[model samples]
Target: FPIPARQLFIDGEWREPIKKNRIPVINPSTEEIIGDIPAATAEDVEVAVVAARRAFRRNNWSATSGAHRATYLRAIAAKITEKKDHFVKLETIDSGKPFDEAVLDIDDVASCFEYFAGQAEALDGKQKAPVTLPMERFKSHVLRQPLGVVGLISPWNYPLLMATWKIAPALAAGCTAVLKPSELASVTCLEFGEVCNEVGLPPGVLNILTGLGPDAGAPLVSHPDVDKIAFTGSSATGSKVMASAAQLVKPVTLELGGKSPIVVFEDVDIDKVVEWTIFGCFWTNGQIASATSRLLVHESIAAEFVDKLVKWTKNIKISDPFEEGCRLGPVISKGQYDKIMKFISTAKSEGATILYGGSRPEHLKKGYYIEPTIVTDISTSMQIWKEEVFGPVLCVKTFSSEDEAIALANDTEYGLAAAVFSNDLERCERITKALEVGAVWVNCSQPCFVQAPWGGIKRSGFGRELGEWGIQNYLNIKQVTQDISDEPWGWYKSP
Candidate 1:
């Protein structure tokens, strides 16, 4: 809650918006105003875009050695670590997540910069073996180059971490960027400008725009000067970003929504299964793209498992985000809170049984909090089972066989993530392969690292983030071949 009033960070300078508009940052737990940030206009986006284009051409970033760039990245990482407390506080205030969760997310943000820093030091291009021709000699090699100016748009859930997922690799690859953090959660992102400046990142190399999606984000993505786009948000919004970028013939990397499943076999320990099932579905208030919101249990143990899940669900402590012993916080906003309530309403109307908590907790009446929810007796035909609720709500069903469980797990349109719990190794392996998600977990949920690639297929969107694959998203490969022989026959100057 220590966040300060911030303005647009453009071309390495904090400046007023062209429109002079400001939006309030709300604390969902208290439903109170915490701070205000500038509401950037499309013209402000143009200024950032032009600055980025100019910097990409005039700066030595692309020509600099990977090892040298690594130094800058590491410096930024160190700066983030140094300011960890500040960031954690601001993130908790802005996103309405528990302070401990904010701590985890901040660490991931720092690690993302550090991980890409290591990658930059060793991003060596490939060399082809020498080939001998009858007429002459030719040598070839392939090199990767930064894809000029990139536009990154991060979501509200993991505000700073999501920004790092895109910004780290893009900058590590020597690409200049213009970032648009969600208007709902822009505090830490605005704070990030100070980190880059303190780390001595080149002027105009990184810019942060604080405003609504339609105002700042759309212009940034569709601008002719921007080279590529990376967005993390709902699929409906992601599709719009893709469509805007497509108008400019630019490539896009989108990490969108999920209705991921958690499949539990009868052979697994009930205690572990119950614990993981709740964690998978309810973590971060179920706002994560990789969150497992659907639970598919084998019929042999479904009833027992559901009872245990309901028992545990009743004990989750939902309160102030900064309060100790708090396991859950309010949803990001009233609109989201209402959306979740609607889903629960619809599920009951569709003949689904509410196995556990369904209404807002009585003690906390003002904030946007909802009880940890678990609904059973739902089928794929119902909207509750098919669509993403993006809340602390979990939909569950029983499957009679492994085949049935697998089918139920993969039934949703989203393929961002899924999980399995089983004692038999072979069964776990088989089900993991059959699930059509980008990331899978066994006996665990929601533990992500910087070393692995993250993204998805189908409606969850394409491309990858984090690790080596993440850097590849911002690079263009070029093949270079040259003739080294002097005894070549001259036909129009040996062309």
Candidate 2:
């Protein structure tokens, strides 16, 4: 696959970074540097922000009708679909995910753009809505207008999809934006800028800046001209972003960390349950924040379920991500590998038993690979049980009854997502309602759709993405009230 341009995309053009610095892009599957991207600093951020501000305030992009904006969004979708294979390879090499999974992500990226294009056109009908008030002579209506320039920061995992999640809706809402993707995996995001340029998107409508968080990201978040911020990353980093935005009293939408749970009942098929459990946590190499890492199994079948789970996890293919039939590949970097190892060691020190794989596979000498890990006998107090490891690690515990299972699942500080498996529909409904999560899967896990709203409460962060809610995040509602009565009472002079 061809490497994308190694430059910053500013003001609708690919240009060299102001500082002329570069960050090497490493292929995690082979531990090799595949390419390098321009490292933008605060200076570059200022230029992008100014350009975005100009587009929002002076150019035709923000002022254009929603139907007009939909044309650009659909064109972007078409270009992405045409370049699907290119992005699949780029995402696979950049993020160390399996080739098939990268293909799925790329498909979703195109679909997201298409979904939001429809939303963009629908915004025209949704813009003006009459409001009912007590007074008969006074008329009131609500106007949903585009927010000004926005700053979007995306994570390394699901590099292009995550960035597109923010970009599709922001552009559809007629908001100009400056996007800063994680420097660790910015290859696909840079390529996305190429797509925008190819589609003849107006200048400054979208800018892609690849740099470290402290350099470009901080300035974009704190800049006075940036009207809003949308971020996806660790909770610690999200809090920092919120604080920076708070300094200017700016609005922000954050999608942060999660330690989501998967509850399995004894009344279900063991075969299907095992597969769902594995796919729930191990998909995306378990780097997904909403991954179902916590397993709550019914006590009656805990032993049998865990045994089958361990055997199946051991059989998973762990090797080169680009190779076909590779189920699990390396983590994003050596640092992430070390972090996972540390979590495993700490779990061991705390007397937790590793039922299956925990260390790296013996055959793989290079790359950041860790075997699918299963830890049992974990208490709620254990760090491995509570913390977000962000790896292919699953922690298991048994629950005696439905009440106990719900209690165990909802005990965490993170409430991003939870999965429940059972043949009992009534029980599924009860458990789904009881779980304190933004999303609940009935019998499946990790099956996210562009038509549904996605987000979480608590530390998982506020605001929703995807569907109509996603577009609303970039809109500002205003109340337009008018009085039609011609006769005015002179209260101030004669009354």
Candidate 3:
């Protein structure tokens, strides 16, 4: 490994864990141990938290100008771009995503840094009209203060990009952070520390701990010194984090799970619909909060759509991530593979007919590989239909009317993301308005950009993650009032 193994990044230094435990990081594509990293202990978390807390309290970074922060962020972005080829290969090996997808994620990571850096340079707080109260000459304005030490917990899926989604904006808001990436894919995240060091980021400003959720993540979430928690993970796990943060009365921004839907109407091009449908549910192997897992199609086009979707899906090549022209890669781990397979069986047991590929490919039996799955005739009440499976499994249903389509799409508690396909602009607008999701796309799905806002409503969890809303997540508002007219009278002294 180019990065030294069995090390935890604390206070901007790569060192062995205080407890000296190692978590073997396996390549999901090969089910082989690539390397090991230190599994942080609660004590290790204590040190990291203390460092981040000190960094924030000292205001070395928090008091720095937004433009200067922009310079550092751009430098970080440049470093990432400089290592573009290397990062792409590392990400592919660490996460088992297709090479092209890994490359795209790195590009998106760069874009995230650049976008937030731009936002940091142009950062502005609210300026209100002068208040006309009894204190007639008082001026009140609001300032956005960084919420000090932020604990960012990222998931295994889309490791580097997810980490950047939180870290970039947190830094842009001038908040120092302690990030705990999932142990399943900690390699890329740990390597990020080298980039920060190369950029000369101040000591204790950013810390990374690779460990189990219970050991490291729970401590970080419940740590009293941490000012805020920004987590992206499952809904079940997110609820636990929410509970822990609630104990501290601390603010949290949770970008949790999703069982997002895509509504397809009759007028769109079938070719484009098929391509986007596959991309929506299968991109990153469908391990995303905004991935369109549930597809609600009109009765008019259901048969034709599924037919083309299955025909095109059979051609997808699931192989070694580094191999040329490999569109699909193995799932992140054997555990994830087993979980997805269990879901498929459960769907079959629940009487949902698997109309397309749902079994593992015979040729790729060595790794955690499974075919892109499509299911139909699943009841809305079924868990397979309602829950976030977080795999390359797409469950579909047909609707007879526009209202019915909207109802079907909104049936789940998740409001993370949904999409509508239609040629009629007015109908697309109507459908977009009717959907309960936080992000609704017209005639497209799963095309997330740094410029637009991303997050969910309902059970998909609270807060936004991209664009200006993202930077605002790490800042708390403070109002400042000044009395221009000094006309104060007391019992002992009058003016």
Best by lDDT: 2
Which lDDT tens digits does candidate 2 get at residues 90-115?
99989999999999999999999999
Candidate 2: give the clashing pairs: none
Which segments of candidate 3 are over 4 A away from where they belong?
1-6, 124-135, 489-495
lDDT of 3 by residue, 155-222 (tens): 98899999999999999999999999998898889989999999999888899999999999999999
* Candidate 1 segments exceeding 4 Å error: 124-136, 487-495
Better of 1 and 2 by lDDT: 2
Superposed Cα RMSD, model 3: 2.0
For 1-495, candidate 1 gives per-residue lDDT tens digits of 356887788788898998899998898988888778999989899889888887788757876766778899999989999999999999988898888899999998989999999888777433233344454466666677788999999999999999999988998888999999999899999999999889888888899999999988988888888999998999999999999888888999999999999988889889888888788878787787787888888889988888889888888888888999778999999889999999999899999988888899999988899988988888789888888888898988888977888878888788999989889989889988999999999878888989988999999999989867988898887777787776644666643
Worst 10 residues of 1 by lDDT: 124-133
Candidate 3, 271: how far from true, in Å? Answer: 1.0
Which 10 successive residues of model 3 have the least lDDT summed? 124-133
lDDT of 2: 0.92
Candidate 2 vs. true structure, TM-score: 0.98
* lDDT by candidate, in order shown: 0.87, 0.92, 0.87
In lDDT terms, how accurate is model 3? 0.87
